[PDB]
Amino acid sequence: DKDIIASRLKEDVAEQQGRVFRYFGDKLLISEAKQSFTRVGENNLTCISCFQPVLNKYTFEESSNNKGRLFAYTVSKDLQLTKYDITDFSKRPKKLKYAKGGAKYIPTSKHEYENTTEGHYDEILTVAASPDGKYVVTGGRDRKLIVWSTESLSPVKVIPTKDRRGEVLSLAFRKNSDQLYASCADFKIRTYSINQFSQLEILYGHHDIVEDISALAMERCVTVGARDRTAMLWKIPDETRLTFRGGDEPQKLLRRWMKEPLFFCEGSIDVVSMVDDFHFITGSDNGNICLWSLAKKKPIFTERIAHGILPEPSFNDISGETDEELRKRQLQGKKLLQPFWITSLYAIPYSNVFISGSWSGSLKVWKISDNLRSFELLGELSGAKGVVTKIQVVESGKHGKEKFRILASIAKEHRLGRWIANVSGARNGIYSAVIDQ
Amino acid sequence: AVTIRTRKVISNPLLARKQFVVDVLHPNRANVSKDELREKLAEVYKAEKDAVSVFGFRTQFGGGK
Amino acid sequence: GAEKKNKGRISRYLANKCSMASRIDNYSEEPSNVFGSVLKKQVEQRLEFY
Amino acid sequence: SKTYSTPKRPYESSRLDAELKLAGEFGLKNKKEIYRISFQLSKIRRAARDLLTRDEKDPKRLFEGNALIRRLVRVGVLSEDKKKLDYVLALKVEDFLERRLQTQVYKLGLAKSVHHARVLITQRHIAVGKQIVNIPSFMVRLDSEKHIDFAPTSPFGGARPGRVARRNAARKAE
Amino acid sequence: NPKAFPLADAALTQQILDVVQQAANLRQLKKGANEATKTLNRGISEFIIMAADCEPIEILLHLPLLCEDKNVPYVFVPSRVALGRACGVSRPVIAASITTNDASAIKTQIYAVKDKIETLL
RNA sequence: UUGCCGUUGCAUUUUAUGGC
Numbered sequence: 001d002k003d004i005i006a007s008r009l010k011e012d013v014a015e016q017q018g019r020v021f022r023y024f025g026d027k028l029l030i031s032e033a034k035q036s037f038t039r040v041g042e043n044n045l046t047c048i049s050c051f052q053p054v055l056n057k058y059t060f061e062e063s064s065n066n067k068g069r070l071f072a073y074t075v076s077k078d079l080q081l082t083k084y085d086i087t088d089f090s091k092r093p094k095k096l097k098y099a100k101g102g103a104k105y106i107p108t109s110k111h112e113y114e115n116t117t118e119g120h121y122d123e124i125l126t127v128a129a130s131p132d133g134k135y136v137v138t139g140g141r142d143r144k145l146i147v148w149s150t151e152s153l154s155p156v157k158v159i160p161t162k163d164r165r166g167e168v169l170s171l172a173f174r175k176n177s178d179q180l181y182a183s184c185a186d187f188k189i190r191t192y193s194i195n196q197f198s199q200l201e202i203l204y205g206h207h208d209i210v211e212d213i214s215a216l217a218m219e220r221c222v223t224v225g226a227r228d229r230t231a232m233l234w235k236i237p238d239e240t241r242l243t244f245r246g247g248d249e250p251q252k253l254l255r256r257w258m259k260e261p262l263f264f265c266e267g268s269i270d271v272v273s274m275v276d277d278f279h280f281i282t283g284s285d286n287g288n289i290c291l292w293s294l295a296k297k298k299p300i301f302t303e304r305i306a307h308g309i310l311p312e313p314s315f316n317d318i319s320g321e322t323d324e325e326l327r328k329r330q331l332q333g334k335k336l337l338q339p340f341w342i343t344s345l346y347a348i349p350y351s352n353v354f355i356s357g358s359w360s361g362s363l364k365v366w367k368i369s370d371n372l373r374s375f376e377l378l379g380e381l382s383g384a385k386g387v388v389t390k391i392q393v394v395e396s397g398k399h400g401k402e403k404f405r406i407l408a409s410i411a412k413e414h415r416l417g418r419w420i421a422n423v424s425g426a427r428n429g430i431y432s433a434v435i436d437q
Numbered sequence: 438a439v440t441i442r443t444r445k446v447i448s449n450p451l452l453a454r455k456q457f458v459v460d461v462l463h464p465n466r467a468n469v470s471k472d473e474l475r476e477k478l479a480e481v482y483k484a485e486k487d488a489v490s491v492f493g494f495r496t497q498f499g500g501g502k
Numbered sequence: 503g504a505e506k507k508n509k510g511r512i513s514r515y516l517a518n519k520c521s522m523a524s525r526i527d528n529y530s531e532e533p534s535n536v537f538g539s540v541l542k543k544q545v546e547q548r549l550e551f552y
Numbered sequence: 553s554k555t556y557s558t559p560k561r562p563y564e565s566s567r568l569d570a571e572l573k574l575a576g577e578f579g580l581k582n583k584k585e586i587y588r589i590s591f592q593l594s595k596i597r598r599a600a601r602d603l604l605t606r607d608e609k610d611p612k613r614l615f616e617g618n619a620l621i622r623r624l625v626r627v628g629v630l631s632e633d634k635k636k637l638d639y640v641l642a643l644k645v646e647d648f649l650e651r652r653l654q655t656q657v658y659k660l661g662l663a664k665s666v667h668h669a670r671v672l673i674t675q676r677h678i679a680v681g682k683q684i685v686n687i688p689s690f691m692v693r694l695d696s697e698k699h700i701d702f703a704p705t706s707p708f709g710g711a712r713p714g715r716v717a718r719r720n721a722a723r724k725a726e
Numbered sequence: 727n728p729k730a731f732p733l734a735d736a737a738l739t740q741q742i743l744d745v746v747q748q749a750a751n752l753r754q755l756k757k758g759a760n761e762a763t764k765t766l767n768r769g770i771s772e773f774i775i776m777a778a779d780c781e782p783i784e785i786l787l788h789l790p791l792l793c794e795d796k797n798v799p800y801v802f803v804p805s806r807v808a809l810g811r812a813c814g815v816s817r818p819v820i821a822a823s824i825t826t827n828d829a830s831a832i833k834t835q836i837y838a839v840k841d842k843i844e845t846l847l
Numbered sequence: 848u849u850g851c852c853g854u855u856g857c858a859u860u861u862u863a864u865g866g867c
Contacts, residue, residue: 037864039731039849078850092848113712157862162710186701198438201462204681207698208747227812237442239460250736264736267808285811319729319783320526320537332728336779336804417816421807429848465705498685499676500705516775518760529729529784537782631834659831661753697831 007399012058015350018218018277021032025352025367025378025404033433035383037410038092042076045428046140048409049073050086050392051129057176064133070394071150072407073136074430075127079120081138083153086394089434112164115144116381120157125415126390128171132178135194139168139182147194159198161190169416174215175349181221183213187222189234206232206240211270211416218277218347219346224269231269232296234235246284248302261303262334273347279372281354283342289320289356291368291375297403300373307340307360310422343414346391348404353378357408358360359423363431365406381433386410386426406433439463441477455482459491462502469496512517515548556587574645580654585689589649596620600640613637627651628694653678653690661698672708679703719723727786732847742775742801743812745791745839748832749824750814759786759821766792770825771774773799773840776799777806777820786821795816 014021033037033113050072053063062068063358071086072093072202079084101119124140135156139145143166161168167185174181180198182190187210208228215221221234233242253263268285275281278294289304310329319330341356347354353367354375367378391408408431412423439461446457459478461469471491479486498502505516519541527533559567562583571583582585603613617637624627624630624640627650649655654670658680663669673676676686681699685708692700702709705716734742749755756765764769766789774793776786793800803809810818824836 038848039622039864042849043848043850050817056845071837095848111713112710140809155801160710162704162770164710187699193438196438199464200440202440202464202704204699219826227744238444239442265740285808311780315780316536320528320534321530322534324531326531330728331785332729332730332733335733338779338808409745419807419810419816420819427849427865499679499703500687501682521760522782525788526782528802529787633838656831659829 003179010213010399011056015217016058018350020276020352020372021351022260022348022351023370027431027437028353028402028404028435029437030365030379031381033381033406033435035381036432037272037384037427038097038432040074040082040429041429042078042080042082042428044077044413045074045389045409045411045430046077046124046415047075047126047390047428048392048407048418048430049129049136049390050084050209050405051128051131051133051136051393051396052396052408053133053175054131066133070396071129072392072430073127073129074405075124075138075140076428077123077413078123079124081124081127081136081153083136084430087396087407089396089405091433093407093430097325097418099148111164112143113160115142115160116158118146118148118158118174119238120144125168128173129182130178130194130392131173131176131201131375134196137171137180137192137194138174143167145182145192147197149391159192159197159199163188167377169210170212172213172221174219177217179214179219179224181215183210183223185209187386189213189221189226189238193264203234203236203239206230212272214280216274216277216435220274220277222274222280223284224272226268226270229266229269231272231280231292233280242294244297244299246288246290246299246302248288264339270342271345272337273345274349274359275347275354275368276350281345281347281398282353283345283356287342287365289342289345291373294404301375303366303375304340305357307358307362307364309337309339310436312337313422337401344390344408346393348393355391355393355406355408357384357391359387359426363386363388363391365408371411378417381406383433384410384429384431386412386423386429387414388431389415401437404435406435407431438471439466441469441474441481445467459494460502464466464501512545512549512552516545519545555591556584556609557591575650577628578656579668580651581672586645588689590645593643593648595626595643597641597643600637603637606643626693626695627691628686628697639679649689651689653685655699656687656690656692657700660697660699675688677702677706677708681684729783730776730802730804731780732800733792733804734843734846737767738801738842738846739777739808742837742839742843743809744824745802745824745832745835746775746809746812747814750812750836752830752832752838754827754830756823756825756830757815758817759789762821762823763789763792765823765825766798767797769796771798771826772794772826772836773801774821774823774844775803775809776800777809777818778802778804780806780820789821799840799847801843 010021015434017105025126046080052070053068056062066284070087073085076079076230079102082095083097086093104117105117107115107117120142122141124138127138128137134150136148136150143161149156163186168182169185170183172181180192184190187206189203192199206225208225210223213223219236223232229246231244248264250263264286266284266286266288268281270285271283273281280292283314287305290299291307292299293299295380315324317325319327321327325434340360342356344357353365355365357363363381364380366375368375389411393404393406395402395404397403410429410431412426442460443457447453458478463469476486476491479489505513523538523541526537571586603617621635628651653673656685656688657663658666658669670688674686676684680696684703705711707714735815745750762774780786806818808818813819813822
């Protein structure tokens with residue numbers, strides 16, 4: 001009856017149609033998870049990417065391979081990636097296979113058309129895991145792409161980016177497929193295919209350094225560059241682009257508020273996730289977090305300063321003086337308060353809730369409303385002191401009851417530069433939170 | 438490795454055809470070898486390799502597409 | 503003469519730390535000793551690097 | 553068509569030193585390049601003079617002057633603040649031919665001289681985003697000024713090295 | 727009357743540091759306090775920027791006495807880590823300078839910035 | 848649950864944390 005047609009539509013026709021369908025706004029109780037830090041013995045952990053086997057993909061023949069266990073992959077600035085077993089929600093993550101490169105992988109010809117050495121030689125920045133569960137891509141400061149096999153972490157193919165500053169910053173697979181999209185820092189965007197180990201297309205057109213990127217099952221790909229306040233939706237089969245700019249000016253926002261309040265202009269757009277094929281979210285630099293439609297150059301809902309404002313430098317380490325009134329007047333009031341950045345943002349695909357992160361320690365999980373044009377603060381997870389460099393969500397259960405696992409990679413340095421500003425008590429680890437229902 | 442990508446596809450049952458524009462993208466090769474293209478296009482569609490036809494190619498300047 | 507490889511990079515470190523301390527205690531209105539002390543600790547850690 | 557036009561006198565001292573300075577400064581080939589850019593400058597500001605000599609608030613002057621300044625800011629020879637019609641009258645040939653691809657990639661860097669810029673972008677290395685441009689006289693629009701980089705199928709980008717390099721690698725590895 | 731008086735507000739901050747990033751990509755910028763004062767008393771400096779929250783403030787407050795003597799504009803910016811992200815470098819640079827060069831394609835934005843900050847001061 | 852140092856745990860996996 002109605003239950004069978006509801007489950008059978010929500011199994012496949014919504015996930016290929018495109019709109020948000022997995023509604024667990026108030027079904028998910030907000031703040032009573034089993035928050036578990038996990039220490040890990042690397043320096044400045046850089047990225048996480050969990051792979052869950054999809055239950056009965058689109059017809060049957062359930063998933064890829066063990067038969068039905070989840071996984072995670074983490075990668076650090078110590079040139080190593082570590083495969084993680086993650087599937088048992090009762091206990092902590094488990095390190096399963098280490099894979100480390102070092103200075104012996106420096107190419108001796110340096111001629112940049114070949115980096116056929118298999119490891120790395122500095123500062124791997126982003127891992128993604130394949131939906132076919134047999135490949136894991138990685139890329140970082142050494143202008144390279146590396147595919148490893150999934151359980152022994154042995155290198156299979158080496159794909160050089162083939163540019164002198166062909167510097168990858170974030171990888172993203174498109175779901176249930178084998179095309180990936182790789183951001184770079186020579187302003188282009190690479191498209192690779194895994195099953196052929198090949199480069200399909202180099203889509204240019206972005207003006208500044210394109211920093212982060214995401215994609216969904218529909219073959220469109222959202223990208224964000226750093227210092228031009230923009231966000232490009234690349235429609236690949238029409239080879240066209242949609243350019244969403246920010247542009248909140250503080251004078252007009254102050255004029256709108258003063259009729260009835262410390263805010264400031266947008267510095268940089270940083271991180272993305274596509275909620276569906278018609279909206280997305282950008283977590284910017286200056287604390288703005290923005291929900292955009294595919295119809296408007298303006299954003300629909302730009303929430304202000306996300307995780308609060310940084311605490312100011314104290315009255316003893318600002319000017320080197322003696323008298324307290326002088327070392328307090330050198331703070332110039334609130335006029336040099338600076339916002340917490342949005343370091344990483346992640347939405348559960350085709351759902352309501354998304355997860356942010358900063359070095360304010362607290363993963364603030366918002367929730368969008370049913371009219372798809374606003375969002376509110378659902379919950380706040382105070383469990384992970386440190387910078388939150390990327391956030392992944394892996395779930396389990398049935399059609400009805402869902403047990404979600406917020407994984408996040410927590411470090412003491414941002415994933416691009418060092419930039420440690422007032423970090424206190426922040427160790428390299430993996431933040432787990434088993435939220436429920 | 439090359440890719441092909443069709444656009445502007447219009448059905449036409451006045452001849453029972455589908456007519457479209459074809460963009461082939463080859464990063465380093467010369468061009469896309471119309472016979473091999475024809476069998477690849479009949480593979481991605483449901484065709485024969487005898488009921489599919491392509492004629493009006495031109496490689497744009499600087500190579501690549 | 504003043505600020506008396508491994509015998510030269512320590513002198514360069516002490517040189518620009520001395521310029522940093524000079525900037526602090528001249529352009530302050532009336533200076534303190536806490537930044538001189540943490541400068542001493544920084545250059546002593548750079549010496550014990552050897 | 554007949555783009556370029558001979559000036560009011562071609563054998564004159566001040567004109568000769570004009571072509572000498574402009575040619576040796578922006579790295580030009582012959583007098584026809586200065587004459588083409590000078591001609592189309594003269595044509596657009598001769599068209600601007602009529603829009604000035606008729607009155608304000610005429611719809612002709614209003615949206616044709618808006619059309620002319622939109623086209624000129626699209627080429628990039630007019631700054632973002634002086635968006636009124638008589639700065640088009642106050643235009644000059646130097647900041648009009650400065651936007652050609654030769655001078656523009658020298659200003660962007662990556663060439664170390666204007667003449668080396670010209671000989672490499674006619675040796676097919678510089679591509680504005682996706683399109684390899686093998687001609688100097690481009691007049692690159694303002695929006696695509698930051699898309700200039702070595703083309704990926706060229707050995708100053710990230711392609712295979714050239715025939716000189718790999719032939720020398722062969723007969724120096726023998 | 728604090729010691730870092732010409733402190734720029736938000737929109738002027740964003741335009742001066744995207745001019746900073748364009749200069750850093752055009753190879754026209756000097757990063758750091760002592761290279762800033764070296765290029766300042768060499769003379770090639772269009773304008774110089776300091777960061778108003780370095781933990782000793784005087785280590786870049788020594789730059790006013792050079793720059794307003796040699797007649798070149800100077801601007802404080804409320805974040806050293808934002809200026810580091812602007813300069814495009816790992817560690818936070820606290821004092822940047824833009825060299826003078828009439829063969830650089832950001833001359834218009836540099837002059838617009840310089841006119842805005844001379845009106846600011 | 849860590850490359851190194853500080854804590855629980857019960858009837859030593861396990862128990863949380865903070866200094867480089």
